[PDB]
Design a protein around this ligand. Structure first.
Ligand code: GBO
Ligand code: ZN
Lengths: 402, 315
């Protein structure tokens, strides 16, 4: 009787509108309507939960190499596609062949701008989003060929070129500012060992001005809290080792409230809709918080589980987010894509794997072949790859230095 | 000029007025990854785009071309960059450009690059006159569009246009009291105008939020706002509050009510009040109710709050 979303008491988690209908309530009721079908189907005239690995693999394999014109609108996000596909192959535990690794490398090299960073495609101008994605990808490959693609001197200049007086960073030259760009600078700067004393001056204070009355963080000061900006906020501070800047208690109250009592998934902001990729952006905050309350002695932390219903998140991802053709979705009756394939999987991995000091405790719903490789919650690549790269770049000096 | 959906559309490589220029094919190298098999229109346009970008041709035909390249892929930030270089070079009529960017936003309201472009025009013109009304039309179609709200906050802060914003907030709250973007905007206006220390203001606000909570006990947005105004100062500073909530409970009792009460007891224990070991129990009784019946999705969060109170408020 052992599946949380199919228990009879679970019918009570349905929306109560208090007889006052609004757009928000009508839409929430429609999703809960669909999700109910999916659940009452799995029970019909018992069966298990399987992660369709072979199907997801074929989809990924093929995409890494070639794409129809439906994908024209991702023509300035190619390194980002690389990262989405390699991360999902890495999670599903799929060795990358060497001629594929090699092709990825030479490609990212053509995306690299002569003044530093990577652009969305060969000969495009550089931008922080494809820059983090390219670096992450090179790390997933984890070889010396890949590590040497990155021009660390030019990376650091590029980053100085984006840094603002008030602590923030532009996404690209003449571009806009938001918390994503700080995360990106922190992620790339710290894996490649290029942090100088002043690079992040003002940055952690800028980030905290972004934490708002709700507990979460918004894209820039004043803005509503959102899972994507919050994760980047927290994670960038964990990198800078300034988690203390934020009010971690209100941040915790906020994220835990973003798990949906019926669906099991996460919404990205309050009173909006469940969405598969928030399985990483929201639920990956719990590991970050766990390690932060712990480095302040919190003695009330658990040592089996993160502070969300891991079981119920897994049930959402496995029953509602899988495409029978391969790949994963926002929610039922959407169509798949590589971004959701990547982040639904990253979130399933996180809901599977607890680790804290010397504690480890896994929780794998459905068949045991469902287990994924663990992901590092700051960088969202594998913990080994993170170690291997940091170690390797630590051998060279920060530039403008020795 | 010659729109991409016109029956008469002609690839650039067949246009006479482009005959002097050799197109520049993309360099994906010998054996590419994430290779996109672009349509014929798309690849033709971008082949010419690369030729002008590379020559740095600051020309009228280069300008009309960027429009096409954007229509095919509005997220190519490199193309938007080049278009702004041409508005400076060719000294184009920036008001014409405002009309262009309005149409595109209506067509693709969730694209970053289109809003960034609009803002740069406004910085250039120093002219906010159309902004609030334009934003209001988009918000009429998607009341939660994050980028629209972001642009609204930027326009208001920048050109100090605070005077009608609260009435706007109030109109929208009436339309959908669950729109958390509006509750956030309410707070944005108030905190930058009057502040929340004017006790007259902090009263009207708290009064109002309870009035909404009464109509819709299960609307989380209001509960988060109530908490977020009072939490600054400390909830035990407001003794009437505990009892006023306890009065809502037999009828209007969401799981948010229960959790607020826990927040109040939490603040009382923290301020050394009377009945320490009594109140520490009424709290733990709710933690267990929530974790174990009324809010189990957060079972782990509440078991942790329970174990925090004990570990802090004992001997
Ligand atoms: C405008 C917005 C959400 C829009 O919400 P919406 O209304 O469309 O949907 P919702 O109702 O809010 O769920 C902001 C939210 C931001 C995110 C969902 C995503 N956060 C990021 O993309 C982080 C950027 C860091 C760049 C790196 S590169 C490798 C990796 N891959 C990736 O996609 N991003 C990262
Ligand atoms: Zn999504």
């Amino acid at each position: 009787e052992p599946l949380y979303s199919l228990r009879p008491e679970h019918a009570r988690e349905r929306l109560q509108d208090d007889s006052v209908e609004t757009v928000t309530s009508i839409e929430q009721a429609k999703v809960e309507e669909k999700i109910q079908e999916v659940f009452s189907s799995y029970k019909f005239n018992v069966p298990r939960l399987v992660l369709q690995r072979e199907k997801h693999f074929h989809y990924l394999k093929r995409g890494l190499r070639q794409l129809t014109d439906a994908y024209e609108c991702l023509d300035a996000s190619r390194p980002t596609l690389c990262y989405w596909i390699l991360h999902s192959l890495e999670l599903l535990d799929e060795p990358i062949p060497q001629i594929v690794a090699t092709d990825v490398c030479q490609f990212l090299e053509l995306c690299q701008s002569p003044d530093g960073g990577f652009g969305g495609g060969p000969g495009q101008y550089p931008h922080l989003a494809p820059t983090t994605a390219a670096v992450n990808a090179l790390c997933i490959i984890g070889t010396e060929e890949a590590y040497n693609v990155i021009n660390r001197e030019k990376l650091l200049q590029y980053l100085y070129s984006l840094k603002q007086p008030d602590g923030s960073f532009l996404m690209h030259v003449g571009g806009e500012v938001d918390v994503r760009s700080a995360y990106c600078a922190a992620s790339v700067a710290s894996l490649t060992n290029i942090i100088t004393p002043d690079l992040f001056e003002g940055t952690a204070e800028w980030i905290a001005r972004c934490q708002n009355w709700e507990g979460g963080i918004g894209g820039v000061p004043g803005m509503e809290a959102h899972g994507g900006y919050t994760f980047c906020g927290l994670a960038a501070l964990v990198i800078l080792k300034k988690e203390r800047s934020l009010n971690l208690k209100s941040l915790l109250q906020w994220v835990t409230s973003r798990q949906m009592r019926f669906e099991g998934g996460f919404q990205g902001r309050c009173n909006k809709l469940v969405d598969g990729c928030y399985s990483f952006w929201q639920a990956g905050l719990l590991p970050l918080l766990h390690r932060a309350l712990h480095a302040q002695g919190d003695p009330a932390l658990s040592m089996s589980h993160w502070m969300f219903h891991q079981q119920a998140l897994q049930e959402y991802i496995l029953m509602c987010c899988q495409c029978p053709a391969g790949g994963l979705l926002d929610k039922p009756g959407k169509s798949r894509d590589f971004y959701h394939t990547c982040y639904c999987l990253s979130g399933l991995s996180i809901a599977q794997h607890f680790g804290s000091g010397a504690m480890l405790h896994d929780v794998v719903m459905g068949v045991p072949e469902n287990v994924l490789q663990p992901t590092h919650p700051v960088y969202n690549i594998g913990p080994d790859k993170v170690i291997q790269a940091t170690t390797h770049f630590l051998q060279k000096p920060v530039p403008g230095f020795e | 000029f010659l729109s991409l959906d016109s029956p008469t559309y002609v690839l650039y490589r067949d246009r006479a007025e482009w005959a002097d220029i050799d197109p520049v094919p993309q360099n994906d190298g010998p054996s590419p990854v994430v290779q996109i098999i672009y349509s014929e229109k798309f690849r033709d346009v971008y082949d010419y785009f690369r030729a002008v970008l590379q020559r740095d041709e600051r020309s009228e035909r280069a300008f009309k071309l960027t429009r096409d390249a954007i229509e095919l892929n509005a997220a190519n930030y490199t193309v938007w960059h080049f278009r702004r270089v041409l508005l400076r070079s060719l000294q184009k009529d920036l008001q014409e450009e405002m009309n262009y960017i309005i149409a595109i936003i209506e067509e693709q309201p969730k694209n970053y690059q289109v809003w960034h472009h609009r803002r740069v025009l406004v910085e250039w013109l120093k002219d906010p006159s159309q902004e609030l009304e334009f934003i209001a039309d988009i918000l009429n179609q998607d009341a939660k569009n994050y980028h629209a709200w972001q642009h609204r906050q930027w326009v208001i802060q920048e050109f100090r246009l605070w005077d009608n914003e609260l009435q706007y907030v109030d109109q929208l709250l009436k339309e959908d009291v669950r729109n958390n973007s509006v509750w956030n905007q309410r707070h944005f206006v108030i905190s930058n105008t009057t502040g929340y220390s004017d006790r007259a203001v902090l009263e009207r606000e708290v009064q109002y939020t309870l009035e909404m909570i009464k109509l819709v006990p299960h609307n989380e947005s209001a509960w988060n706002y109530l908490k977020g105004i009072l939490q600054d100062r400390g909830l035990s500073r407001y003794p009437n509050l505990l009892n006023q909530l306890l009065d809502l409970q037999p009828s209007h009792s969401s799981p948010y009510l229960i959790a607020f009460l826990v927040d109040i007891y939490e603040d009382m224990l923290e301020n050394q009040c009377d009945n320490k070991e009594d109140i520490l129990n009424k709290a733990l009784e709710l933690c267990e109710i929530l974790a174990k019946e009324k809010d189990t999705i957060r079972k782990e969060y509440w078991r942790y709050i329970g174990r925090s109170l004990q570990s802090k408020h004992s001997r």
